[PDB]
Amino acid sequence: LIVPYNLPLPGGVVPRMLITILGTVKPNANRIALDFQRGNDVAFHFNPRFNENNRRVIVCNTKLDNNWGREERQSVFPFESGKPFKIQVLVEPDHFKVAVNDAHLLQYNHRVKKLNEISKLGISGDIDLTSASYTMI
Ligand SMILES: CO[C@@H]1[C@@H](n2cc(-c3cc(F)c(F)c(F)c3)nn2)[C@@H](O)[C@@H](CO)O[C@H]1C(=O)N(c1cc(Cl)cc(Cl)c1)[C@H]1CC[C@@H]1O
User: Fold this and answer.
1) SS3 letters for 74-89?
2) Nearest-atom index, ligand 1, CA of 49
């Protein structure tokens, strides 16, 4: 698929919804972003950074009224330049749970409460996107 890519989430998200993003990281990747949006608000921004002060970090945040909130950062970094990945975002009642390549990575508590209005997933950055889909577990 072509990046950037928008995946509609009609009627938003619900607990037990498993969103699977498959792709390959580009060989000289700098950044990747998943943006779960409620209109212009970003309920959940998931942002692997490959070279922030010569380190790799996962930055997560929410954007409300076009303002970024308090970042939640994780140094566990499962992505590798040039390699195929699977990001799974499992919607739970109180958080998003992220697993990469079938290993738990992080949880992000719901700041945006209206899950049934989080109706788009934006996928951007330094990937070849293979597929973006969801199922109910
Ligand atoms: C560059 O801005 C990022 C935010 N971001 C990333 C992308 C993005 C990522 C992709 F992978 C991608 F492919 C793409 F197309 C677009 N779009 N927006 C977004 O990642 C946001 C997450 O908090 O961080 C922003 C940030 O870099 N800072 C920022 C942070 C806070 Cl809280 C407040 C403020 Cl005003 C700026 C830093 C300056 C000093 C701050 O530490």
Assistant:
1) ECCCCCCCCCEEEEEE
2) 11
Domain 1-137 class in CATH:
mainly beta
What technique determined this structure? Answer: X-ray
Question: Could you tell me the residue ranges of all domains in the chain?
Answer: 1-137
Spatial contact of 69 and 33, defined as CB atoms under 8 Å apart:
no
For ligand 1, whether the C-beta of 59 sits within 6 Å is yes
How many whole angstroms from 136 Cα to the centroid of ligand 1?
Answer: 31
101-110, long-range: CB < 8 A, 24+ apart? 103/78, 105/58, 105/74, 105/76, 105/78, 106/58, 106/60, 106/72, 106/74, 106/76, 108/44, 108/46, 108/60, 108/72, 110/43
In units of Å, what resolution does this entry have?
1.4
